[PDB]
Design a protein around this nucleic acid. Structure first.
Ligand code: FES
Ligand SMILES: [K+]
Ligand SMILES: [K+]
Ligand SMILES: [Mg+2]
Ligand SMILES: [Mg+2]
Ligand SMILES: [Mg+2]
Ligand SMILES: [Mg+2]
Ligand SMILES: [Mg+2]
Ligand SMILES: [Mg+2]
Ligand SMILES: [Mg+2]
Ligand SMILES: [Mg+2]
Ligand SMILES: [Mg+2]
Ligand SMILES: [Mg+2]
Ligand SMILES: [Mg+2]
Ligand SMILES: [Mg+2]
Ligand SMILES: [Mg+2]
Ligand SMILES: [Mg+2]
Ligand SMILES: [Mg+2]
Ligand SMILES: [Mg+2]
Ligand SMILES: [Mg+2]
Lengths: 97, 23, 118, 86, 72, 128, 48, 74, 137, 142
RNA sequence: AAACUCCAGUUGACACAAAAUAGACUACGAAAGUGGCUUUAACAUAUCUGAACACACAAUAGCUAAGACCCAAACUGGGAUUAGAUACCCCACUAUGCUUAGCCCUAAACCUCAACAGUUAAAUCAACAAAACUGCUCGCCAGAACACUACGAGCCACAGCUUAAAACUCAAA
């Protein structure tokens, strides 16, 4: 018929879907350094996904990892271990003065 | 909706339970 | 199946720490376990004070034992660890490396209408 | 009780300014939800009541975020009238 | 269009040209369009591989004086 | 039950499994696996014993054998968990579903219905 | 392939004969499972 | 309103009529009252834009159909 | 060096000092700010009591105990008895959201004590005892 | 939508809160129930914008050290000024220093709100001390 | 006000009670329910529909027996309020909430939406709720009130549950 007519196919310019900082990485309860990045420095409270930026799957793994590490003797509950206060700040929360 | 039908049933059941209690 | 024993031992000198590990690995073998590896995570301060066997602990030796055992061995091993006075806290979990992580394309957007609707 | 002390919920005072240190501590406890948690725990909230308020709070937050997004989007045209007189 | 596949790869590999689109000129040709036309010419010469047909096209334009700065 | 030394259904037909170290044989046996792996061996044992084509899993016979293995697992579960109402429901539902299968197999293929009853030890009962 | 890989690993598995050697060989070593993530998704291994 | 001035001039040039302003309720359906009993309404209404400034249909589209006036519209 | 709101960690080597004393050696002012009272106890780093004052021990009674000015007065009283024992710098540990939570700290300062840190230790159970039923008002 | 109604017929209409619109607005017009919601939401954004500017060190090192906290922020519906209530500290002298720093900063703050162009058309920002502790300051001085 | 004053504060030891944050998530389960950790077992059906009663379950409250008991808490007692206060407010304490073994079988047990399959074109549609419908099957309904009642029958239920009328009365509900 006509060569210039549109052709059916999938979007070639489509961009990849977004990925969380932990997409594709194993979350172990023994890696307290990683887990400590998602708890409050002052209170030890686990941050919600709106603060951590994690997806539902990794938000769940982090939560389950923290709870396991805390009661198994690897991670404190009421505060962030001070050793990990100088690690990269990956959470969208501003606290001090 | 209003609870006027429930209120009729409520009083009927209260008075029945009280009647059974007395006798 | 394949399990991982997270073992926190009483802070002791090298001879008594080795005797505790040997006594603990033999208990696994006596129950039919095939021990794969033993890892030392180092002695550290506990995240909180732990009372075990009429003693208070602030430091402990963290060790891992990767092993295979029948499903009935877990219950019997947990009981053995509860009676060893040199073990502060011992937990047996399914080895994390057995569970294979499923691939993720990314974060699909969720319609806000569903949020309030749900 | 079994944890180390003077780490959790601890703020240092700078240059003797205790008012600013107290405001920082109160801001920390507020953002982490401890202040609201303490208050809701003075009397027992019954499970049906907790679910109702949690459901009300989640729907109000969504409605406010969606109403903020709409105004931000519709404020782009708040510029001066380009066709005044027409 | 079939050429959209070539445009997606060109933008990924080389990015958008520092040259500015002039959508007022109805006969404007961008660096990507110049790349697509050469890519189409070489395909008609019998070459059928995709990864090979893309590398030869970049060389041809460099010979013609075109600036192709790879993004990464 | 199959012996604990029995190899897993996946590793039984790999070439050279009989010449590996004893430790490797223990790690590929039922002893080192969960109970669900023992049930896959039981199902395959009944399939070869009863059905004409042991690889046809969509036939009414294979479904009766597969469900009969699940039913036996629930019975063993409930022998140790007598207040588990969730699995008691699953058992009673599974028995009802098998009876429906047996009813449909009896009506369509009686010779196969008889072999399923003999092989699995099922005494078919007509409903009241 | 899984039986072959597993057959080599069994050579390094702990046994009653080599138990003492592996127990002592562990007290001298250290295994670190800690690492941190960045906003760009990059792992930051510990300084050791 | 970007084109109000352009459209008003085009109407004057061709000898026709333009309504680019706020459309008051009943210009067509109540014309005799607003203009007089002998007012002649348009025989053709040409919409260069069929939507009003709240992205709804221009009221004159519905009212032109009510008055049996043919409409041309972009 | 820039100021850190995070307290110095014990066992590490900090340069901060108060009258030649390390953070671990500074006495502690324990403020219990209840809804109907405020209690202040100053103790040494070794848990030796040095001063105690509450709104009740300062002559306040009934609803007057549950006021800021009553807590401020209790702080001044505890500060005076603590200053006599050699206390200048104190670490404040306040538990409770009562009206004397902040006022009790002001009284400690007006009494001659210098607060170097503030710690909240308000008890929050993580799941714990059931509180009393809601009030109908 | 939610139990809170959001079916507005003129939903797409461009919200234009400017001082000039009020003078051309019809006072005869009666505000809709949802007309307040648009104003209430804008006030929430102005609160978040000022509150965030306050806690960032760079904007003004004087401002950050003060650790100012805003009690409430209600823009005037007239659009003349953006009221910005700031909680008053108990220290009597500190309420003057904080107030003085705020007044000087306020002039620069308005330009910095134009950096966030969505909030560009912001009226002159006005800071109000919370009389709860401030009113008592005047009396105790006398 | 009463109450306590072997009381309170700090520190240490310390549960058969309850499970911050995560959770702004919306998952699991037939429903009821299920949100600390670990492990074991484990989540029926290769066409659907199919029971007041068969089969198996079923929050809270409650019963029988033996235990635990921090805290909460009907009832009860005391304080106060009030014209009265068998309430609302304060304090104390019990049954009870927990465990074990049996019962009991109810709920605004409610997305107030029966199961399955299909459609988005017709008229979009009484109203509101939750856009409007088709096929097919089971269950159920036929003015109000009498009536979650009477009688009968069944039931570990005995002041109970399930099923469930009639007479008199009204022109509404
Ligand atoms: S986006 Fe892939 S795991 Fe989070
Ligand atoms: K919990
Ligand atoms: K409901
Ligand atoms: Mg009645
Ligand atoms: Mg059915
Ligand atoms: Mg039924
Ligand atoms: Mg029936
Ligand atoms: Mg019933
Ligand atoms: Mg029940
Ligand atoms: Mg009970
Ligand atoms: Mg009590
Ligand atoms: Mg009384
Ligand atoms: Mg009791
Ligand atoms: Mg319990
Ligand atoms: Mg319910
Ligand atoms: Mg049905
Ligand atoms: Mg009737
Ligand atoms: Mg009833
Ligand atoms: Mg009855
Ligand atoms: Mg009867």
């Amino acid at each position: 018929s006509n060569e210039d007519l549109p052709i059916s196919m999938e979007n070639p310019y489509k961009e990849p879907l977004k990925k969380c900082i932990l997409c594709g990485k194993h979350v172990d309860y023994k890696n307290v350094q990683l887990l400590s990045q998602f708890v409050s420095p002052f209170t030890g409270c686990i941050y919600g996904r709106h603060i951590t930026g994690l997806c539902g799957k990794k938000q769940k793994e982090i939560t389950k990892a923290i709870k396991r590490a805390q009661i198994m003797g690897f991670m404190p509950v009421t505060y962030k271990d001070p050793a990990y206060l100088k690690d990269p700040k990956v959470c969208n929360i501003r606290y001090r003065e | 909706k209003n609870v006027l039908k429930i209120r009729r049933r409520k009083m009927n059941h209260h008075k029945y339970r009280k009647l059974v209690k007395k006798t | 199946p394949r399990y991982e024993l997270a073992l926190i031992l009483k802070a002791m000198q090298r001879p008594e720490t080795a005797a505790t590990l040997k006594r603990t690995i033999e208990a696994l073998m006596d129950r039919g376990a095939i021990v794969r590896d033993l890892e030392n995570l180092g002695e550290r301060a506990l995240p909180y004070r732990i009372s075990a066997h009429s003693q208070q602990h602030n430091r402990g030796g963290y060790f891992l034992v990767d092993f295979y055992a029948p499903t009935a061995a877990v219950e019997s091993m947990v009981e053995h660890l509860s009676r060893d006075i040199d073990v502060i806290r011992g937990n047996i979990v399914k080895h994390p490396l057995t569970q294979e992580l499923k691939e993720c394309e990314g974060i699909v957007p969720v319609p806000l209408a569903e949020k309030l609707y749900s | 009780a079994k944890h180390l002390k003077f780490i959790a919920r601890t703020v240092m005072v700078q240059e003797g300014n205790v008012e600013s240190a107290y405001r920082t501590l109160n801001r920390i406890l507020t953002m982490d939800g401890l202040i609201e948690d303490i208050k809701h725990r003075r009397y027992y909230e019954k499970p049906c009541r907790r679910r109702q308020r949690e459901s009300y709070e989640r729907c109000r937050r969504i409605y406010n975020m969606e109403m903020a997004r709409k105004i931000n989007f519709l404020m782009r045209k708040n510029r001066a009238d380009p066709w005044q007189g027409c | 269009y079939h050429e959209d596949r070539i445009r997606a790869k060109f933008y990924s590999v080389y990015g958008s040209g520092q040259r500015a689109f002039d959508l007022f000129n109805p006969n404007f040709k961008s660096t990507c369009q110049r790349f697509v036309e050469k890519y189409t010419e070489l395909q008609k010469l019998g070459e059928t591989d995709e990864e090979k047909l893309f590398v030869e096209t970049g060389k041809a334009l460099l010979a013609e004086g075109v600036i192709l700065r790879r993004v990464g | 039950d199959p012996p604990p030394s029995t190899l897993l259904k996946d590793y039984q037909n790999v070439p050279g499994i009989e010449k590996v170290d004893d430790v490797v044989k223990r790690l590929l046996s039922l002893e080192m696996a969960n109970k669900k792996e023992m049930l896959k061996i039981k199902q395959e044992q009944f399939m070869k014993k009863i059905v004409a084509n042991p690889e046809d899993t969509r036939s009414l016979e294979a479904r009766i054998i597969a469900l009969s293995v699940k039913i036996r697992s629930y019975e063993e579960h409930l022998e140790k968990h007598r207040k588990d109402k969730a699995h008691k429901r699953y058992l009673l539902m599974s028995i009802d579903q098998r009876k429906k299968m047996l009813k449909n197999l009896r009506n369509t293929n009686y010779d196969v219905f008889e072999k399923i009853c003999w092989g699995l030890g099922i005494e078919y009962t007509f409903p009241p | 392939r899984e039986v072959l890989q597993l057959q080599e690993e069994v050579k390094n598995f702990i046994t009653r004969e080599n138990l003492e050697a592996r127990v002592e060989a562990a007290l001298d070593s250290r295994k670190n499972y800690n690492w941190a993530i960045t906003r760009e998704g990059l792992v930051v291994r510990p300084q050791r | 309103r970007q084109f109000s001035y352009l459209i008003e001039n085009m109407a004057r040039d061709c000898g026709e009529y333009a309504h680019t302003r706020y459309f008051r309720g009943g210009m067509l359906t109540n014309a005799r009252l607003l203009f007089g009993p002998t007012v002649r309404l348009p025989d053709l209404i040409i919409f260069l834009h069929t939507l009003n400034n709240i992205f709804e249909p221009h009221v004159a589209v519905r009212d032109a159909a009510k008055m049996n006036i043919p409409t041309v519209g972009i | 060096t820039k100021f850190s709101i995070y307290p110095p960690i014990p066992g590490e080597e900090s340069s901060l000092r108060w009258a030649g004393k390390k953070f671990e050696e500074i006495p502690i002012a324990h403020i219990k700010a209840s809804h109907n009272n405020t209690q202040i106890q100053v103790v040494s780093a070794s848990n030796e009591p040095l001063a105690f004052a509450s709104c009740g021990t300062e002559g306040f009674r009934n609803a007057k105990k549950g006021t800021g000015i009553a807590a401020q007065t209790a702080g001044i009283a505890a500060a005076a008895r603590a200053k006599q024992k050699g206390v200048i710098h104190i670490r404040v540990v306040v538990k409770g959201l009562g009206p004397g939570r902040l006022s009790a700290m002001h009284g400690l300062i007006m009494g001659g004590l210098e607060v170097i840190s503030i710690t909240d230790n308000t008890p929050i159970p993580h799941x714990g005892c059931r509180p009393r039923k809601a009030r109908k008002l | 939508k939610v139990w809170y109604e959001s079916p507005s017929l003129g939903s797409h209409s461009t919200y234009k809160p400017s001082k000039l619109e009020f003078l051309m607005r019809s006072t005869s017009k009666k505000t809709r129930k949802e007309d307040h919601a648009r104003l209430r939401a804008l006030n929430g954004l102005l609160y978040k914008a000022l509150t965030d500017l306050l806690c960032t060190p760079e904007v003004s090192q004087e401002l950050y050290d003060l650790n100012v906290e805003l009690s409430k922020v209600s823009l005037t519906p007239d659009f003349s000024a953006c009221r910005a209530y700031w909680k008053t500290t108990l220290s009597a002298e500190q309420n003057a220093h904080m107030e003085a720093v705020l007044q000087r900063s306020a002039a620069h703050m308005r330009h910095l709100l134009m950096s966030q162009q969505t909030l560009r058309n912001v009226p002159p920002i006005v800071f109000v001390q919370d009389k709860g502790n401030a009113a008592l300051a005047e009396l105790d001085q006398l």
